[PDB]
């Protein structure tokens, strides 16, 4: 048998990328645009850590296109992603989306643009 | 067998949603992951495999051996 009822109580990793996929579906347009810029500069170079961006140049960009006023508001509107574990950050000051290149460009083509 | 997997999925035309599932071009590996995540699922309460380090589940251990 396939253990119908027993499959119900137990749970595996499918039972994150898709977790954030619904979060971004419910946000503000400024958050949408800033994450759009993040995902471009992190998908340009599976979305690997080498492909991310530095927060120095990231602030340079989100201030050039006139989105971020300074670093405090930037990190604030970033932690809303962080406070649900919606993007990765390591160190350069790399903010790298651990979500796959496929799923990332899917976000672009479907929910972002 | 992907050939048999398409033999068997479209073998049910009577359902609408299952038919629309049956034309997905990457359905082979998808259903592979489905069957795998049902099998490794039902093979933990049976004791054979152990989900070593829950919250990680990147590797596992085969408890039983034939012997």
């Amino acid at each position: 048998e396939p253990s119908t009822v027993e499959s119900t109580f137990q749970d595996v990793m499918k039972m994150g990328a898709e977790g954030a996929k619904y979060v971004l579906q419910s946000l503000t347009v400024n958050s949408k645009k800033m994450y759009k810029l993040l995902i471009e500069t992190q998908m340009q170079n599976r979305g690997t850590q080498r492909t991310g961006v530095e927060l120095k140049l990231f602030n340079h960009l989100c201030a050039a296109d006139f989105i971020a006023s300074n670093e405090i508001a930037l990190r604030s509107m970033l932690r809303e992603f962080i406070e649900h574990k919606m993007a990765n950050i390591t160190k350069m000051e790399i903010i790298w989306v651990p979500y796959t290149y496929a799923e990332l460009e899917k976000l672009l083509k479907t929910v972002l643009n | 067998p992907k050939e048999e997997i398409l033999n068997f999925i479209r073998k049910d035309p009577s359902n609408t949603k299952l038919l629309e599932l049956a034309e997905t071009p990457d359905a082979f590996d998808k259903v592979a992951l489905i069957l795998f995540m049902q099998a490794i699922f039902a093979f933990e309460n049976m004791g054979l495999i152990k989900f070593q380090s829950t919250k990680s589940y990147d590797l596992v251990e085969k408890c039983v051996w034939r012997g």
């Binding site: 990793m13 499918k14 599976r46 651990p98 796959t100 | 299952l18 599932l21 590996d29 589940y57």
Partner: peptide, 19 residues
């Protein structure tokens, strides 16, 4: 030590999976 990680997997929605 490039291991096949379940991240690189074709995910299936709960509906398709269930059905």
């Amino acid at each position: 030590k490039s291991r096949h990680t379940m991240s690189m997997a074709p995910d299936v929605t709960r509906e398709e999976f269930s059905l």
